[PDB]
Design a protein around this motif. Structure first.
Motif, PDB file in Angstrom:
ATOM      1  N   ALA A  40       0.820  -1.192   0.000  1.00  0.00           N
ATOM      2  CA  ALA A  40       0.000   0.000   0.000  1.00  0.00           C
ATOM      3  C   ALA A  40       0.860   1.249   0.000  1.00  0.00           C
ATOM      4  O   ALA A  40       2.034   1.211   0.362  1.00  0.00           O
ATOM      5  N   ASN A  41       0.269   2.354  -0.433  1.00  0.00           N
ATOM      6  CA  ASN A  41       0.940   3.637  -0.400  1.00  0.00           C
ATOM      7  C   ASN A  41       0.312   4.505   0.669  1.00  0.00           C
ATOM      8  O   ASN A  41      -0.889   4.419   0.916  1.00  0.00           O
ATOM      9  N   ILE A  42       1.124   5.335   1.310  1.00  0.00           N
ATOM     10  CA  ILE A  42       0.617   6.187   2.371  1.00  0.00           C
ATOM     11  C   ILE A  42       0.365   7.608   1.894  1.00  0.00           C
ATOM     12  O   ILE A  42       1.246   8.255   1.327  1.00  0.00           O
ATOM     13  N   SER A  43      -0.863   8.065   2.106  1.00  0.00           N
ATOM     14  CA  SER A  43      -1.222   9.465   1.969  1.00  0.00           C
ATOM     15  C   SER A  43      -1.845   9.915   3.280  1.00  0.00           C
ATOM     16  O   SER A  43      -2.720   9.245   3.820  1.00  0.00           O
ATOM     17  N   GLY A  44      -1.396  11.050   3.795  1.00  0.00           N
ATOM     18  CA  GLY A  44      -1.842  11.490   5.100  1.00  0.00           C
ATOM     19  C   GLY A  44      -1.482  10.423   6.107  1.00  0.00           C
ATOM     20  O   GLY A  44      -0.344   9.950   6.137  1.00  0.00           O
ATOM     21  N   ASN A  45      -2.453  10.027   6.922  1.00  0.00           N
ATOM     22  CA  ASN A  45      -2.245   8.951   7.876  1.00  0.00           C
ATOM     23  C   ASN A  45      -2.977   7.689   7.434  1.00  0.00           C
ATOM     24  O   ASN A  45      -3.274   6.812   8.243  1.00  0.00           O
ATOM     25  N   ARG A  46      -3.283   7.612   6.146  1.00  0.00           N
ATOM     26  CA  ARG A  46      -3.983   6.459   5.607  1.00  0.00           C
ATOM     27  C   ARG A  46      -3.128   5.761   4.570  1.00  0.00           C
ATOM     28  O   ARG A  46      -2.247   6.372   3.972  1.00  0.00           O
ATOM     29  N   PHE A  47      -3.378   4.474   4.366  1.00  0.00           N
ATOM     30  CA  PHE A  47      -2.707   3.746   3.311  1.00  0.00           C
ATOM     31  C   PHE A  47      -3.722   3.022   2.433  1.00  0.00           C
ATOM     32  O   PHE A  47      -4.730   2.495   2.921  1.00  0.00           O
TER      33      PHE A  47
END
Length: 501
Positions: free
Chosen positions: A201-208
């Motif tokens: 997965a890739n992380i954006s913000g505090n989400r993946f």
């Protein structure tokens, strides 16, 4: 005959996509075949909005059904290990017939606003799942892995139905590259591990956001890939994570959770999101997943973007009618403004809010002098109430101007009343990392609340907290607040970097 809605592959895809939306948690119902159908896909996938870890999603309802019909509810949450996340199931283990069998869920608390600065960090934890119910899916009457006759045929089979097996999860999070890999394993009583999924997965913000790839496509239960894996980092400094994936054929719903070791790590802020209560002038934190253009109230989302310069958004949440005025349209990576609950013509819980997506620390300009132009929102209370309201006027509006010296790592700023040609607030701050900290001051004698004998407001060295936002710190925002008897103030401000014409 059993008539159901024909769904296109388009519609199915869209439905899966909607599940990728960030949330505090998710929960689904374990599929149970009605007598006439041979197959029941996972479908009742609801978001979780409650912020209490102790509250197990729909454990109430499941308890109830286990009460009217007799019942034995068992709940696994991983509460004995995790501090910010809960994942697992609540399941009537004595289930028969057509009543609810239970739910599988994950949920979390304090969506991280700080991440480890870099390196690969290991998270260890557990995972659980529910299958769909299918008679024609080659699921064996005896299962070597799952208890009982024909597990997964009429009722979805879960991690709870597993013969002396444990379901462990391991993750490597590359914080330097915001990438994430992981393994979901099954360990037997003989301590033999079996990889079941690998995740990326890739992380954006505090989400993946990413995928789970089933390592054994011959598995009748755990053999389908997922292009819809989403989860989040939880805890103030990303101590834990939790998340889910859905099989592309809605034949499996899996949740997982991890927790990193005790090795003390340097963190960096990625998100600013807080509010100032305009009657106590205290600052509280807001939940936020890394999108500044969305406001999370009571676990439900509010889009702040709009066609106007600033926009009024009214949204009903848990009966509470919320109104938020969000500025501005020229700010891509932050929002700020007003937020209250509508009580007829009255308004309660008045507050100011600020949100922004912090710039990468290594992307903060090392030198150079730039001007930032924007506006602000504020309430000052000293017997009467002076107010600043965000506007589009650069000449005589409620201006906010900033000189940022990235070389000297200093920020000087002026906050104007409308019409005024002298600022009523004056900010001096020092740049550290991707933020700045300083003081807001009034002039020696301050500024008048109303334009004799109407009072004057005066404020000395009030702490200012701020951040740079955007890919290259082209936007900046900040807040300050103070409550006393000689006067009180709450203020948030935002400004866009300039170029000369």
């Amino acid at each position: 005959v059993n008539y159901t809605d024909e769904e296109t592959q388009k519609r199915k895809k869209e439905e899966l996509d909607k599940l990728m939306e960030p949330a505090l948690g998710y929960v689904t119902k374990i599929p149970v075949n009605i007598p006439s159908v041979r197959k029941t896909e996972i479908s009742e996938i609801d978001t979780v909005t409650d912020e209490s870890l102790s509250l197990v999603p729909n454990e109430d309802k499941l308890r109830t059904i286990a009460n009217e019909n007799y019942g034995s509810v068992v709940t696994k949450s991983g509460s004995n290990t995790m501090n910010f996340v809960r994942s697992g199931y609540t399941i009537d283990v004595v289930h028969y017939g057509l009543r609810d069998k239970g739910y599988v869920y994950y949920k979390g608390v304090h969506p991280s606003k700080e991440l480890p600065k870099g390196n690969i960090i290991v998270y260890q934890g557990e995972w659980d799942f529910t299958s769909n119910a299918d008679l024609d899916a080659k699921r064996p009457n005896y299962n070597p892995e799952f208890n009982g006759y024909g597990a997964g045929q009429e009722v979805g089979v879960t991690s709870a139905d597993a013969k002396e097996r444990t379901y462990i999860s391991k993750f490597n999070i590359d914080f330097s590259n915001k990438k994430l890999n992981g393994q979901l394993l099954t360990k037997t009583k003989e301590n033999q591990e079996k990889l079941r999924y690998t995740v990326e997965a890739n992380i954006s913000g505090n989400r993946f956001r990413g995928k789970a790839t089933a390592t054994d496509k011959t598995d009748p239960i755990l053999g389908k890939d997922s292009e819809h894996l989403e989860g989040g980092l939880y805890g103030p400094k990303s101590e834990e994570l939790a998340g889910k994936f859905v099989a592309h054929d809605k034949s499996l719903f899996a949740v997982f959770s991890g927790k990193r070791g005790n090795d003390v790590l340097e963190t960096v802020k990625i998100i600013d999101a807080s509010k100032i209560d305009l009657t106590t002038f205290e600052s509280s934190e807001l939940n936020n997943f890394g999108n500044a253009n969305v406001l999370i109230i009571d676990g439900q989302k509010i889009d702040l973007a709009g066609a106007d310069f600033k926009n009024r958004k009214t949204v009903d949440i848990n009966g509470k009618t919320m109104v938020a005025i969000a500025c501005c349209s020229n700010l891509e990576y932050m929002k700020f403004g007003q937020l209250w609950q509508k009580e007829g013509e009255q308004t309660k819980d008045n507050s100011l809010f600020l949100q922004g997506e912090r710039t990468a620390t290594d992307k903060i300009p090392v030198g150079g002098n730039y001007k930032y132009v924007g506006t602000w929102d504020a309430l000052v209370s000293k017997g009467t109430n002076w107010v600043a309201e965000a506007d589009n006027n650069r000449e005589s509006g409620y201006r906010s101007e900033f000189d940022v010296n990235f070389g000297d790592k200093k920020v000087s700023g002026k906050l104007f009343d409308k019409g005024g040609i002298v600022p009523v607030f004056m900010i001096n701050a020092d740049i550290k990392g991707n933020g700045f900290t300083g003081t807001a001051n009034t002039t020696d004698t301050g500024f008048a609340l109303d334009s004799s004998q109407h009072g004057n407001a005066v404020f000395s060295d009030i702490k200012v907290n701020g951040g740079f936002y955007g890919p290259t710190a082209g936007e900046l925002g900040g807040q300050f607040h103070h409550k006393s008897d000689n006067g009180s103030v709450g203020a948030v401000f935002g400004a866009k970097r300039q170029i000369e014409k």
